Amino acid sequence: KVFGRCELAAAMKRHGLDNYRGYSLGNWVCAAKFESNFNTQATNRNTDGSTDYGILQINSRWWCNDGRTPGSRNLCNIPCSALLSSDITASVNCAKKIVSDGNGMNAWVAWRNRCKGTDVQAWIRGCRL
Ligand SMILES: C[C@@H](O)CN1CCN(CC(=O)O)CCN(CC(=O)O)CCN(CC(=O)O)CC1
Ligand SMILES: C[C@@H](O)CN1CCN(CC(=O)O)CCN(CC(=O)O)CCN(CC(=O)O)CC1
Ligand SMILES: [Cl-]
Ligand SMILES: [Cl-]
Ligand SMILES: [Cl-]
Ligand SMILES: [Cl-]
Ligand SMILES: [Gd]
Questions:
Q1: How many C-beta atoms surround the C-beta of residue 120 within 10 A?
Q2: Which end is more exposed in the chain, N or C (fewer Cβ atoms within 10 Å of the end residue's Cβ)?
């Protein structure tokens, strides 16, 4: 599924991302745009063999099982394919664990370079929330 901006904001708010560990909702919408272009089916291979999956490009090195990243962990206890579904529940729950692990939202490269320090409220402006 390719989400609209306001559609995704509403879905993310419903699963409790708005102000999760102090990160306002516009930060999450901004990250998703630049990580995946709002597309749940996005995948991208990294140079060490791992792959990033879904709307927030979660990495098979630590977080999910894709059967081909040898000696990795699966700390969200899921197959990486559950992270490509049109329902974002599994992506959101896994991201809650990541953003809590000590590095906050800096774990998402595109957030650090394109969203951090900007007007992030602009990404939910106009939405009926
Ligand atoms: C809870 C998360 O920390 C899980 N974590 C994966 C788990 N392992 C081992 C472990 O963390 O016990 C990888 C080890 N490694 C450095 C280290 O921890 O020493 C990774 C660092 N990051 C996060 C961080 O630690 O900042 C990756 C996420
Ligand atoms: C093995 C190294 O990771 C040693 N580690 C010291 C041991 N403990 C906990 C533990 O690691 O079992 C520290 C807790 N902690 C992070 C965490 O683990 O959750 C501090 C951050 N860093 C590393 C990191 O986690 O990125 C400190 C280095
Ligand atoms: Cl915001
Ligand atoms: Cl694997
Ligand atoms: Cl959803
Ligand atoms: Cl933080
Ligand atoms: Gd770690």
A1: 19
A2: C
Q: How far is ligand 1, taken at its centre, from the CA of residue 100, in Å?
A: 11
Mutate to test the pocket of ligand 1, among 48, 61, 62 (most ligand atoms within 8 A of CB): 62
Which of 34-72 are b and which e, b meaning 16 or more Cβ less than 10 Å from the residue's Cβ? bbbebebebbeeeeeebbbbbbbbbbbbbbbbbeebeeb
Looking from the CA of residue 102, the nearest atom of ligand 1 is 26
- CATH number for 44: 1.10.530.10
Domain span at residue 10 reads 1-129
Is 48 part of any known ligand binding site? no
For this entry, resolution in Å reads 2.1
Q: Which residues contact 106 (CB under 8 A, 6 or more apart)?
A: 112, 116
Q: What share of the chain is helix, strand, coil (3-state, %, to 5)?
A: 40, 10, 50
Distance 64 CA to ligand 3 centre (A): 28
